[PDB]
Design a protein around this ligand. Sequence first.
Ligand SMILES: [Zn+2]
Ligand SMILES: [Zn+2]
Lengths: 113, 93, 796, 72
Amino acid sequence: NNELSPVALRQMSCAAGTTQTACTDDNALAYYNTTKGGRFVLALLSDLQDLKWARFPKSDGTGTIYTELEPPCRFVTDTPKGPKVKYLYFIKGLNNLNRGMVLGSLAATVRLQ
Amino acid sequence: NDALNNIINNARDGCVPLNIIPLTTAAKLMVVIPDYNTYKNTCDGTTFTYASALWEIQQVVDADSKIVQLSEISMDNSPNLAWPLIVTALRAN
Amino acid sequence: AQSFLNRVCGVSAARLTPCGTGTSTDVVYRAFDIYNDKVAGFAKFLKTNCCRFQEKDEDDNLIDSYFVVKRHTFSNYQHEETIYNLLKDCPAVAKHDFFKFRIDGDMVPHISRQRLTKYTMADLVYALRHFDEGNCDTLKEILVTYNCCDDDYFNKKDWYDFVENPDILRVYANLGERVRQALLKTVQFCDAMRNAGIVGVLTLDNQDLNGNWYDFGDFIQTTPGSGVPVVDSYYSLLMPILTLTRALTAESHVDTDLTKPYIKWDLLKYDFTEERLKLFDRYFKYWDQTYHPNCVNCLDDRCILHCANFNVLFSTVFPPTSFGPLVRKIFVDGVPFVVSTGYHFRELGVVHNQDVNLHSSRLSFKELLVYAADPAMHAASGNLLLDKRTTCFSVAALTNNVAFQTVKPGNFNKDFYDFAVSKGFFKEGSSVELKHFFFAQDGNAAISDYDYYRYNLPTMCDIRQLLFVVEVVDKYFDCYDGGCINANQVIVNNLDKSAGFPFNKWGKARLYYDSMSYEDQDALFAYTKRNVIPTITQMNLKYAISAKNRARTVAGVSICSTMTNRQFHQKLLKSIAATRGATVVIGTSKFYGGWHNMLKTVYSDVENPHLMGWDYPKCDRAMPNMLRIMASLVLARKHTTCCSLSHRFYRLANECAQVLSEMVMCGGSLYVKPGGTSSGDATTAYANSVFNICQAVTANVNALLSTDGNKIADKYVRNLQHRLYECLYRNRDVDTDFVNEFYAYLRKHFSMMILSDDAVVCFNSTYASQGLVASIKNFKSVLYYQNNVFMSEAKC
Amino acid sequence: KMSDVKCTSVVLLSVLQQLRVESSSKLWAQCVQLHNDILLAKDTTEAFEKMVSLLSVLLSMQGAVDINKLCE
RNA sequence: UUAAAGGUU
RNA sequence: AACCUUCCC
Ligand SMILES: [Zn+2]
Ligand SMILES: [Zn+2]
């Protein structure tokens, strides 16, 4: 009885862009894995076709880290918004387990067709 | 310096493993034999084959470094020999 | 009862004979890899939920083909129906039935899986990992069923021993193709789950001993083209069986079938990187972490271990003649030498020297020292050797005659014996008697000791558990300090000892330490940080008093390695030898109350104290290379400031080249050392202590993870087990908080005192009885599956 | 009394070794086997005949003058 | 191995 | 232990 991911991992709003400083203000749904030794986000969701860079300012504020993303994954979500064609991005170097946890949470509590 | 230069020049980079240098270049082989049965399967006769080459026997000695003729190595006469037999041979062509 | 049997068989028309009576289930005892929100581990449980049926064969013969039915809820029935009609077309999926039958007054659903085997691979891994002599009863059945041996093979004496019965290596190796085909079949399952959009965890509970996969209960489905097979516990738990059963021997044959002859590789080929990548893609396709065939490109110590494990597995396919120094011709003053300019480690891959000097003009004292030490010229100028007395690889014979070395009987002091006898000693029926003597030896003594280095075998370690264990073990060496020192600070105990193979023909170690000034020594040390210097260690034969007639031998290592290893471990280990109250008690005297202080320290606040001790049968000649590399890495962990990554890697390469797989000169002929450790180098005792601590921590981890978990009545220990499983098989990065917590737990409940390969431990008896800390059988199983050695009660 | 046998076996092997017996491989091998096995015996009823077998080795050469050296 | 939390004597 | 609740298929 091996369970994929007990407990669900939540998400905040983050900023991304195509390259370098293309990040404008806030354009991404960042599914996070918060640990008390620093916050580490898991996945990115967007309605933007091709975003490769993302950014988060450090906790001290003086710094801001950029994250490089994988090629997009396309799916459709069902909502009162009707169908939503959305593209999902994994920060390159994400292991299979974080991918599985995010995908399981999404397929469990977010509608898909 | 002639059988070693040829095999070195065939390397793509010039690097060859050390353990193949005496295997394909050395001109003398010394086999050590613990018993007659192992002698039968490996060093039988005046000429044998090893390392994909043909070698011919020239000298055989016992543990006491005394000469043994090839006729004395029998089955029944084996118990009368010091038996780490060292057989040295030259690579024949 | 009859209709259930006629429905379970169904269309396939099989002659099922019920193993469980009636329309009821059949509880069994099976091993599980389990992880809930409550409990985790890899342990044996009771499995109800099942109605087995054995299949008959023409003349009513019973075969291993089971029709296991599964009673469960309606929701699970729907969930497994909607996912099996997605992975239906994969060969590696056992055929399901999914029918509904009226059991008693209500209609219940069943998921009938056709033609499985009695045991899964969790059972095989558990039986070969947690081994006990007189409780086997399932390893025997697995071996007998698949024609690895017979039933009368188990009536032998010590049939499980790796040392006194070296034929068990052949019995296991006949069970090594069902594992290769299982890996081949799980790769297809992973690909099918990918292309079909399914996410889930692959556990080796759901793969029968053929290769088919038959559970989809904890799976989820996403859009096609993106499916995630989570294979981290599967491969990690399976790793030791791959080399214990020698599963990849079929790669030695052409077209990968055991009936065809072996592949005839080119003799001059030394770089097998493409083959290594091909094998990794073949069998470990969905292993997420990256793999570096050559460990010169690794990122840190942990990645070095991770890639060296895979290289250990993959180097058993390539010819033994391609491993060793990579020699190359260079010209000086118009005269050509043949000198070593690299190495090809079985574990570390190909390493190239950075400061190779081609077309030089003169050789200084440093260069003359370097070129006189490597085996290049000595082997290339000698004649070929074929020694039938040993199975170890023989390269060359330096002289024209072999030398036989004898041992003298020893002198007798008659006056003391006469005095003692006059004092009423040595009578009949006395509690004291002579048992220690000087034993003599015949001509073949050392060449008989090399057939004990024959005992070393290539071993693949469980990489995730090994990484966690190394992180825990590193905390026992935190109170110390270390680093590099200049040639001024080196302290040499005795300067009248031999300098090694070449160099003993000219003087002792004093001559080579005066001749070279401090600048030359510093230059040699700095050279060793970016080049590899293979050396030769002589094999001397000892002459001392003992109680057993074995001709013990020692290693005369050369002088260059001595200097360069001193300029590291002098400062590393003088701190270890000068600390009081630590776990490692090296350097603490027993006089002036040292023994009492040590014993009182090892009794430091244990709740229900018991004492236990053990000894490894053959520590030096059977220790796997992976653990020696681990010990060297944790010793080099102290150079975080004085050395960059490249310097650390090249120092590790030098160590592996001259104290692990060096070229030994035994009686005037050069032989290749399979592995183990060379007793006679600078850091033998400290590396042995590190290895001992690693084994103890591994035993504790195995003892804790194999406990049921539902029965543990203490919440803190249950949460500790849960988080231990998470930190082992669900995290890629070190968690310092839980490492500290587990180290504190071990120090509280399992107090050690270590000195080289000797250990004394005070442990909580209640926890040990409950299975929360390591017992002695946990040590025996760990030794069996991680040391290729079976330990008995004569040592513990 | 077995201690006497073990000590005299030690002395006999010492004198045999110093008589250049080890220049013949098989004779030295047999002598070493006998000496090592006498030291490990646990009853006096096997050590004595192995001792007599080992003494028959020295009584066969012509390097030890016997009549003179048993001057009593 | 058996949703969770809470509740009383 | 009895016991009920938002329940859970
Ligand atoms: Zn690496
Ligand atoms: Zn350093």
